[PDB]
């Protein structure tokens, strides 16, 4: 969840400034997969985060299903934030993918725009 | 470690190895130092630089393992016995060629000393009794491994050996000297100093006296020393009338005529 920055206009491999101002303990586990920018707000900028699962599976005591055995959380993320030189990186949304969503396709307001499963659209 | 790398780079641009070769442990790049102390044989830097937290045994090995490739088996054992392979250490001690064999027992001597094993032990006693090669070396040497050993009462038998030699030969202030580092030795230590040790080298050390009293003109302190010099003149066989004429000269001088014409009447005697 940190930020880092770094400078190299003059050589370098340097030493981060870090921000602690990101708070949500939630994306700890999510790789980004997909990336967009808004074509009309420069300000403006979306990724889609995958939940990736470690090399070799386990299995619980009782017959749940492997990681399903609670309660519900996005397969995939997508987040949303405002970028300035001001104020640094803003969250503007975080959101599950909807679940007739397979991929983040893109974003330009009012929408993101998402890749939709072709076993649901005939229903 | 990477600003430390670039510190490194500075230096290296100004041609300091020293200096630039601290940056291997600092910012962690240890191989390159390996390589880089290897190409300019500053190895002894680069393990001594080694000392710090970041470090193993497997560093000394690497590094032994590197004056074995290059055949250097003095510079070999020397890393193998600070990676703590005393048998290795001693047989490329022992497989060193005749160019280097003091320096090579010497730290022979040190293997065992430090490895204390009774195999290795004999076998190197084995060597110094000659038992591999057709020859005995000099006492000194098994002097030194009792030392080594902490064998400090053989020690002290050898270094009496090496003594008695000395006075035979008029060598006065080299037995002095011999017996002199044993004593002080055996003294440091919790430990029996032989009454024959002892009263030699108080004996030896009297007769140095003398030079410094006659010297300084105390005829008294000279003489009185020379008394008991002349009192075991037996252990002095090279200067027996020298010393002798001297007592019955310095006890005049000092007013004991009585010491003095007990000196003469020994001095009178057919053999002197």
Same mark, same amino acid.
């Given at each position: 969840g940190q930020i880092d920055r770094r400078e190299t206009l003059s050589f370098n491999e340097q030493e981060t400034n870090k921000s602690?101002?990101?708070?949500?303990?939630?994306?700890?586990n999510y790789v980004p997969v997909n990336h967009f920018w808004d074509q009309s707000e420069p300000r403006l900028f979306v990724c889609e985060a995958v939940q990736e699962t470690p090399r070799s599976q386990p299995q619980s @005591?009782?017959?749940?299903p492997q990681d399903g055995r609670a309660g519900p959380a996005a397969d995939v993320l997508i987040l949303s934030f405002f970028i300035s030189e001001?104020?640094?990186?803003?969250?503007?949304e975080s959101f599950p993918?909807? @679940?007739?969503?397979?991929?983040l396709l893109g974003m330009e307001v009012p929408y993101y725009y998402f890749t939709r499963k072709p076993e649901e659209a005939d229903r | 470690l990477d600003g430390a790398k670039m510190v490194a780079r500075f230096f290296l641009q100004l041609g300091d190895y020293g200096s630039a070769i601290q940056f291997l442990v600092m910012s962690k790049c240890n191989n390159e130092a390996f390589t880089l102390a290897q190409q300019h044989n500053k190895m002894e830097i680069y393990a001594d630089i080694?000392?710090?937290?970041?470090?193993?045994?497997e560093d000394y090995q690497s590094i032994a393992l590197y004056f074995e490739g290059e055949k250097r088996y003095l510079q070999a054992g020397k890393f193998f016995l600070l990676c703590g392979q005393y048998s290795r250490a001693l047989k490329h001690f022992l497989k060193?060629?005749?160019?280097?064999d003091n320096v090579a027992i010497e730290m022979a001597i040190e293997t065992v000393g430090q490895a204390k094993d009774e195999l290795l032990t004999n076998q190197l006693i084995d060597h110094l009794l000659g038992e591999n090669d057709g020859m005995p070396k000099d006492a000194k040497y098994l002097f030194r491994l009792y030392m080594a050993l902490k064998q400090y009462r053989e020690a002290a038998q050898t270094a009496i050996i090496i003594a008695r030699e000395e006075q035979s030969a008029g060598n006065y202030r080299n037995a002095h000297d011999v017996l002199f580092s044993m004593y002080a030795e055996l003294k440091s230590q919790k430990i029996k100093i032989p009454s024959e040790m002892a009263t030699n080298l108080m004996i030896l050390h009297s007769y140095i006296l003398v030079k410094i009293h006659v010297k300084n003109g105390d005829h008294m302190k000279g003489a009185r020393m020379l008394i008991r010099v002349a009192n075991n003149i037996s252990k002095f066989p090279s200067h027996i009338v020298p010393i002798l004429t001297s007592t019955v000269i310095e006890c005049h001088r000092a007013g004991l005529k009585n010491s003095a014409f007990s000196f003469a009447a020994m001095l009178m005697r057919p053999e002197y």
């Amino acid at each position: 969840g940190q930020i880092d920055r770094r400078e190299t206009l003059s050589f370098n491999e340097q030493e981060t400034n870090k921000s602690h101002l990101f708070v949500d303990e939630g994306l700890k586990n999510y790789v980004p997969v997909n990336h967009f920018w808004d074509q009309s707000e420069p300000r403006l900028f979306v990724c889609e985060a995958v939940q990736e699962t470690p090399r070799s599976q386990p299995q619980s @005591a009782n017959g749940q299903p492997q990681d399903g055995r609670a309660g519900p959380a996005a397969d995939v993320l997508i987040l949303s934030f405002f970028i300035s030189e001001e104020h640094g990186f803003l969250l503007h949304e975080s959101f599950p993918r909807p @679940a007739t969503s397979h991929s983040l396709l893109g974003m330009e307001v009012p929408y993101y725009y998402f890749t939709r499963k072709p076993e649901e659209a005939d229903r | 470690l990477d600003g430390a790398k670039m510190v490194a780079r500075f230096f290296l641009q100004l041609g300091d190895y020293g200096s630039a070769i601290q940056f291997l442990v600092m910012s962690k790049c240890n191989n390159e130092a390996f390589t880089l102390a290897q190409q300019h044989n500053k190895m002894e830097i680069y393990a001594d630089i080694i000392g710090s937290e970041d470090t193993t045994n497997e560093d000394y090995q690497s590094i032994a393992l590197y004056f074995e490739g290059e055949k250097r088996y003095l510079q070999a054992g020397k890393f193998f016995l600070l990676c703590g392979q005393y048998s290795r250490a001693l047989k490329h001690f022992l497989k060193c060629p005749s160019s280097e064999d003091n320096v090579a027992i010497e730290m022979a001597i040190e293997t065992v000393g430090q490895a204390k094993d009774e195999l290795l032990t004999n076998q190197l006693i084995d060597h110094l009794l000659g038992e591999n090669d057709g020859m005995p070396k000099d006492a000194k040497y098994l002097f030194r491994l009792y030392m080594a050993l902490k064998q400090y009462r053989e020690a002290a038998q050898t270094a009496i050996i090496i003594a008695r030699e000395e006075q035979s030969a008029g060598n006065y202030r080299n037995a002095h000297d011999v017996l002199f580092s044993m004593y002080a030795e055996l003294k440091s230590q919790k430990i029996k100093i032989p009454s024959e040790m002892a009263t030699n080298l108080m004996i030896l050390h009297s007769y140095i006296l003398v030079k410094i009293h006659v010297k300084n003109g105390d005829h008294m302190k000279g003489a009185r020393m020379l008394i008991r010099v002349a009192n075991n003149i037996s252990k002095f066989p090279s200067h027996i009338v020298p010393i002798l004429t001297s007592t019955v000269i310095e006890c005049h001088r000092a007013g004991l005529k009585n010491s003095a014409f007990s000196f003469a009447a020994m001095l009178m005697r057919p053999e002197y």
